[PDB]
Amino acid sequence: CRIPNQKCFQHLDDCCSRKCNRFNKCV
């Protein structure tokens, strides 16, 4: 997975915490 506070697209579910948000960041 990708780590919290780094850049993502909300259609890509691989954030270690589960969710990407509207500011392009993983929660």
Side-chain angles (χ1 to χ4, degrees):
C1 47
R2 188 163 297 242
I3 81 178
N5 307 305
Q6 284 213 140
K7 69 296 191 187
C8 46
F9 303 106
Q10 312 71 19
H11 70 178
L12 225 61
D13 64 294
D14 66 304
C15 284
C16 301
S17 45
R18 206 78 190 102
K19 167 171 287 187
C20 196
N21 75 83
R22 73 269 90 154
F23 297 124
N24 96 112
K25 185 175 63 58
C26 287
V27 305

mmCIF file of all heavy atoms in Angstrom:
data_model
loop_
_atom_site.group_PDB
_atom_site.id
_atom_site.type_symbol
_atom_site.label_atom_id
_atom_site.label_comp_id
_atom_site.label_asym_id
_atom_site.label_seq_id
_atom_site.Cartn_x
_atom_site.Cartn_y
_atom_site.Cartn_z
ATOM 1 N N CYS A 1 0.835 -1.256 0.000
ATOM 2 C CA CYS A 1 0.000 0.000 0.000
ATOM 3 C C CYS A 1 0.834 1.255 0.000
ATOM 4 O O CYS A 1 2.028 1.212 0.281
ATOM 5 C CB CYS A 1 -0.979 0.030 1.242
ATOM 6 S SG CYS A 1 -0.265 -0.380 2.878
ATOM 7 N N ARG A 2 0.159 2.407 -0.238
ATOM 8 C CA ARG A 2 0.675 3.754 -0.111
ATOM 9 C C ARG A 2 0.432 4.270 1.299
ATOM 10 O O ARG A 2 -0.572 3.922 1.921
ATOM 11 C CB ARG A 2 -0.036 4.691 -1.102
ATOM 12 C CG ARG A 2 0.601 6.079 -1.135
ATOM 13 C CD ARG A 2 0.220 6.929 -2.358
ATOM 14 N NE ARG A 2 0.740 6.187 -3.568
ATOM 15 C CZ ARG A 2 1.660 6.633 -4.440
ATOM 16 N NH1 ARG A 2 1.895 7.917 -4.686
ATOM 17 N NH2 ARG A 2 2.340 5.778 -5.195
ATOM 18 N N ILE A 3 1.364 5.108 1.829
ATOM 19 C CA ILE A 3 1.358 5.665 3.166
ATOM 20 C C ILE A 3 0.503 6.932 3.355
ATOM 21 O O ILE A 3 0.248 7.649 2.381
ATOM 22 C CB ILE A 3 2.803 5.883 3.681
ATOM 23 C CG1 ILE A 3 3.499 7.192 3.183
ATOM 24 C CG2 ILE A 3 3.647 4.616 3.354
ATOM 25 C CD1 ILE A 3 4.909 7.388 3.746
ATOM 26 N N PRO A 4 0.059 7.263 4.612
ATOM 27 C CA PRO A 4 -0.684 8.476 4.979
ATOM 28 C C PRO A 4 0.098 9.768 4.756
ATOM 29 O O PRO A 4 1.248 9.847 5.188
ATOM 30 C CB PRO A 4 -0.978 8.315 6.499
ATOM 31 C CG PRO A 4 -0.900 6.814 6.772
ATOM 32 C CD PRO A 4 0.199 6.387 5.787
ATOM 33 N N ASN A 5 -0.535 10.758 4.089
ATOM 34 C CA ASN A 5 -0.031 12.089 3.764
ATOM 35 C C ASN A 5 0.642 12.221 2.402
ATOM 36 O O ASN A 5 0.904 13.338 1.962
ATOM 37 C CB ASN A 5 0.790 12.809 4.876
ATOM 38 C CG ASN A 5 -0.023 12.813 6.162
ATOM 39 O OD1 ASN A 5 -1.160 13.262 6.212
ATOM 40 N ND2 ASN A 5 0.557 12.310 7.264
ATOM 41 N N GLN A 6 0.889 11.101 1.667
ATOM 42 C CA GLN A 6 1.410 11.100 0.304
ATOM 43 C C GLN A 6 0.246 11.055 -0.694
ATOM 44 O O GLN A 6 -0.886 10.681 -0.368
ATOM 45 C CB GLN A 6 2.467 9.974 0.020
ATOM 46 C CG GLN A 6 3.882 10.246 0.621
ATOM 47 C CD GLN A 6 5.034 9.684 -0.242
ATOM 48 O OE1 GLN A 6 6.080 10.306 -0.404
ATOM 49 N NE2 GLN A 6 4.864 8.495 -0.862
ATOM 50 N N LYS A 7 0.558 11.500 -1.932
ATOM 51 C CA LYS A 7 -0.292 11.710 -3.093
ATOM 52 C C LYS A 7 -0.993 10.498 -3.724
ATOM 53 O O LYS A 7 -0.371 9.460 -3.942
ATOM 54 C CB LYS A 7 0.538 12.470 -4.173
ATOM 55 C CG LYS A 7 1.710 11.745 -4.869
ATOM 56 C CD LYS A 7 2.904 11.326 -3.989
ATOM 57 C CE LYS A 7 4.104 10.878 -4.832
ATOM 58 N NZ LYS A 7 5.176 10.315 -3.984
ATOM 59 N N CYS A 8 -2.306 10.622 -4.044
ATOM 60 C CA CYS A 8 -3.120 9.554 -4.616
ATOM 61 C C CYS A 8 -4.332 10.078 -5.371
ATOM 62 O O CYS A 8 -4.720 11.240 -5.271
ATOM 63 C CB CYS A 8 -3.610 8.536 -3.525
ATOM 64 S SG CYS A 8 -4.290 9.315 -2.016
ATOM 65 N N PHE A 9 -4.983 9.151 -6.102
ATOM 66 C CA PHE A 9 -6.191 9.287 -6.885
ATOM 67 C C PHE A 9 -7.225 8.432 -6.158
ATOM 68 O O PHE A 9 -6.959 7.251 -5.927
ATOM 69 C CB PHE A 9 -5.928 8.696 -8.311
ATOM 70 C CG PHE A 9 -4.755 9.374 -8.976
ATOM 71 C CD1 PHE A 9 -3.520 8.698 -9.088
ATOM 72 C CD2 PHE A 9 -4.855 10.683 -9.492
ATOM 73 C CE1 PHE A 9 -2.416 9.305 -9.702
ATOM 74 C CE2 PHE A 9 -3.752 11.292 -10.113
ATOM 75 C CZ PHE A 9 -2.537 10.601 -10.219
ATOM 76 N N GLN A 10 -8.435 8.957 -5.783
ATOM 77 C CA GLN A 10 -9.494 8.279 -4.999
ATOM 78 C C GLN A 10 -10.077 7.001 -5.574
ATOM 79 O O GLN A 10 -10.628 6.185 -4.839
ATOM 80 C CB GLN A 10 -10.667 9.200 -4.508
ATOM 81 C CG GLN A 10 -10.236 10.519 -3.824
ATOM 82 C CD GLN A 10 -9.672 11.448 -4.870
ATOM 83 O OE1 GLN A 10 -9.890 11.317 -6.063
ATOM 84 N NE2 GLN A 10 -8.829 12.411 -4.521
ATOM 85 N N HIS A 11 -9.869 6.766 -6.903
ATOM 86 C CA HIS A 11 -10.161 5.524 -7.610
ATOM 87 C C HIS A 11 -9.131 4.409 -7.363
ATOM 88 O O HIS A 11 -9.291 3.310 -7.883
ATOM 89 C CB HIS A 11 -10.329 5.743 -9.151
ATOM 90 C CG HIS A 11 -9.099 6.093 -9.983
ATOM 91 N ND1 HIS A 11 -9.160 6.258 -11.350
ATOM 92 C CD2 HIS A 11 -7.783 6.249 -9.662
ATOM 93 C CE1 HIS A 11 -7.898 6.507 -11.783
ATOM 94 N NE2 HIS A 11 -7.028 6.514 -10.792
ATOM 95 N N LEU A 12 -8.038 4.664 -6.581
ATOM 96 C CA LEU A 12 -6.987 3.703 -6.276
ATOM 97 C C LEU A 12 -7.023 3.418 -4.782
ATOM 98 O O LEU A 12 -6.541 4.197 -3.960
ATOM 99 C CB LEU A 12 -5.603 4.286 -6.722
ATOM 100 C CG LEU A 12 -4.642 3.355 -7.490
ATOM 101 C CD1 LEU A 12 -5.292 2.883 -8.797
ATOM 102 C CD2 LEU A 12 -3.327 4.098 -7.761
ATOM 103 N N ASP A 13 -7.631 2.269 -4.392
ATOM 104 C CA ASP A 13 -7.926 1.841 -3.031
ATOM 105 C C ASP A 13 -6.755 1.409 -2.126
ATOM 106 O O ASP A 13 -6.936 1.112 -0.942
ATOM 107 C CB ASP A 13 -9.066 0.763 -3.106
ATOM 108 C CG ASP A 13 -8.657 -0.525 -3.847
ATOM 109 O OD1 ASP A 13 -8.414 -0.467 -5.081
ATOM 110 O OD2 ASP A 13 -8.593 -1.587 -3.169
ATOM 111 N N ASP A 14 -5.503 1.371 -2.651
ATOM 112 C CA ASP A 14 -4.292 0.961 -1.955
ATOM 113 C C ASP A 14 -3.637 2.005 -1.030
ATOM 114 O O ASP A 14 -2.417 2.151 -1.031
ATOM 115 C CB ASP A 14 -3.266 0.349 -2.970
ATOM 116 C CG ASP A 14 -2.728 1.364 -3.994
ATOM 117 O OD1 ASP A 14 -3.565 1.984 -4.698
ATOM 118 O OD2 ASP A 14 -1.481 1.517 -4.078
ATOM 119 N N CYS A 15 -4.426 2.694 -0.160
ATOM 120 C CA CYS A 15 -3.938 3.595 0.894
ATOM 121 C C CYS A 15 -3.972 2.720 2.127
ATOM 122 O O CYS A 15 -5.002 2.116 2.417
ATOM 123 C CB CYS A 15 -4.823 4.858 1.184
ATOM 124 S SG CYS A 15 -4.717 6.205 -0.040
ATOM 125 N N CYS A 16 -2.858 2.599 2.900
ATOM 126 C CA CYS A 16 -2.706 1.726 4.089
ATOM 127 C C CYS A 16 -3.764 1.829 5.205
ATOM 128 O O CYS A 16 -3.964 0.884 5.961
ATOM 129 C CB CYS A 16 -1.292 1.849 4.755
ATOM 130 S SG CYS A 16 0.135 1.437 3.695
ATOM 131 N N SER A 17 -4.461 2.988 5.271
ATOM 132 C CA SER A 17 -5.527 3.389 6.158
ATOM 133 C C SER A 17 -6.922 3.203 5.572
ATOM 134 O O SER A 17 -7.897 3.401 6.292
ATOM 135 C CB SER A 17 -5.314 4.897 6.436
ATOM 136 O OG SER A 17 -5.019 5.607 5.219
ATOM 137 N N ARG A 18 -7.009 2.842 4.267
ATOM 138 C CA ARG A 18 -8.177 2.596 3.439
ATOM 139 C C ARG A 18 -8.514 3.717 2.462
ATOM 140 O O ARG A 18 -8.920 3.450 1.337
ATOM 141 C CB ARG A 18 -9.476 2.154 4.202
ATOM 142 C CG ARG A 18 -10.471 1.315 3.383
ATOM 143 C CD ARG A 18 -10.029 -0.145 3.256
ATOM 144 N NE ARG A 18 -10.931 -0.793 2.240
ATOM 145 C CZ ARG A 18 -10.576 -1.032 0.973
ATOM 146 N NH1 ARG A 18 -9.442 -0.581 0.444
ATOM 147 N NH2 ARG A 18 -11.391 -1.760 0.220
ATOM 148 N N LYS A 19 -8.437 5.004 2.867
ATOM 149 C CA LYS A 19 -9.009 6.107 2.076
ATOM 150 C C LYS A 19 -8.066 7.218 1.606
ATOM 151 O O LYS A 19 -7.281 7.782 2.371
ATOM 152 C CB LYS A 19 -10.186 6.715 2.931
ATOM 153 C CG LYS A 19 -10.791 8.076 2.512
ATOM 154 C CD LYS A 19 -12.059 8.506 3.258
ATOM 155 C CE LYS A 19 -13.308 7.707 2.857
ATOM 156 N NZ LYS A 19 -14.515 8.278 3.493
ATOM 157 N N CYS A 20 -8.228 7.646 0.311
ATOM 158 C CA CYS A 20 -7.673 8.871 -0.278
ATOM 159 C C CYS A 20 -8.790 9.926 -0.179
ATOM 160 O O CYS A 20 -9.963 9.572 -0.226
ATOM 161 C CB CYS A 20 -7.255 8.671 -1.772
ATOM 162 S SG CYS A 20 -6.166 9.964 -2.442
ATOM 163 N N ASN A 21 -8.479 11.235 -0.035
ATOM 164 C CA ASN A 21 -9.489 12.291 0.115
ATOM 165 C C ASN A 21 -9.432 13.288 -1.038
ATOM 166 O O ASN A 21 -8.606 13.145 -1.932
ATOM 167 C CB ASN A 21 -9.409 12.958 1.530
ATOM 168 C CG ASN A 21 -8.234 13.926 1.741
ATOM 169 O OD1 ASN A 21 -8.320 15.092 1.371
ATOM 170 N ND2 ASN A 21 -7.107 13.502 2.321
ATOM 171 N N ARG A 22 -10.280 14.362 -1.037
ATOM 172 C CA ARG A 22 -10.352 15.402 -2.065
ATOM 173 C C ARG A 22 -9.138 16.324 -2.291
ATOM 174 O O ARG A 22 -9.024 16.964 -3.337
ATOM 175 C CB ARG A 22 -11.642 16.234 -1.855
ATOM 176 C CG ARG A 22 -11.719 17.233 -0.671
ATOM 177 C CD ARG A 22 -12.288 16.732 0.664
ATOM 178 N NE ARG A 22 -11.175 16.182 1.502
ATOM 179 C CZ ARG A 22 -11.225 16.136 2.835
ATOM 180 N NH1 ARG A 22 -12.313 16.392 3.546
ATOM 181 N NH2 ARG A 22 -10.091 15.867 3.457
ATOM 182 N N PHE A 23 -8.177 16.386 -1.324
ATOM 183 C CA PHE A 23 -6.936 17.155 -1.414
ATOM 184 C C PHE A 23 -5.754 16.406 -2.055
ATOM 185 O O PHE A 23 -4.644 16.933 -2.068
ATOM 186 C CB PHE A 23 -6.538 17.642 0.016
ATOM 187 C CG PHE A 23 -7.605 18.565 0.561
ATOM 188 C CD1 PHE A 23 -8.224 18.293 1.793
ATOM 189 C CD2 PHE A 23 -8.028 19.706 -0.153
ATOM 190 C CE1 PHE A 23 -9.224 19.129 2.310
ATOM 191 C CE2 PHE A 23 -9.038 20.538 0.348
ATOM 192 C CZ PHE A 23 -9.634 20.252 1.583
ATOM 193 N N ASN A 24 -6.000 15.165 -2.597
ATOM 194 C CA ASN A 24 -5.112 14.190 -3.265
ATOM 195 C C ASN A 24 -4.305 13.343 -2.316
ATOM 196 O O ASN A 24 -3.319 12.727 -2.680
ATOM 197 C CB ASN A 24 -4.316 14.646 -4.555
ATOM 198 C CG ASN A 24 -2.869 15.135 -4.394
ATOM 199 O OD1 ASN A 24 -1.934 14.479 -4.835
ATOM 200 N ND2 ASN A 24 -2.632 16.286 -3.746
ATOM 201 N N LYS A 25 -4.683 13.323 -1.040
ATOM 202 C CA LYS A 25 -3.888 12.741 0.014
ATOM 203 C C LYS A 25 -4.577 11.533 0.632
ATOM 204 O O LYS A 25 -5.808 11.484 0.695
ATOM 205 C CB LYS A 25 -3.712 13.943 0.987
ATOM 206 C CG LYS A 25 -2.832 13.787 2.203
ATOM 207 C CD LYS A 25 -2.635 15.077 3.023
ATOM 208 C CE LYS A 25 -3.904 15.669 3.658
ATOM 209 N NZ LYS A 25 -4.553 14.689 4.563
ATOM 210 N N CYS A 26 -3.785 10.532 1.126
ATOM 211 C CA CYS A 26 -4.198 9.325 1.859
ATOM 212 C C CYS A 26 -4.337 9.713 3.325
ATOM 213 O O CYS A 26 -3.419 10.281 3.918
ATOM 214 C CB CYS A 26 -3.173 8.123 1.844
ATOM 215 S SG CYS A 26 -2.949 7.162 0.308
ATOM 216 N N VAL A 27 -5.479 9.396 3.957
ATOM 217 C CA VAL A 27 -5.749 9.717 5.338
ATOM 218 C C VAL A 27 -4.826 8.964 6.365
ATOM 219 O O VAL A 27 -4.298 7.858 6.228
ATOM 220 C CB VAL A 27 -7.207 9.465 5.644
ATOM 221 C CG1 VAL A 27 -8.094 10.248 4.647
ATOM 222 C CG2 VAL A 27 -7.517 7.955 5.659
#
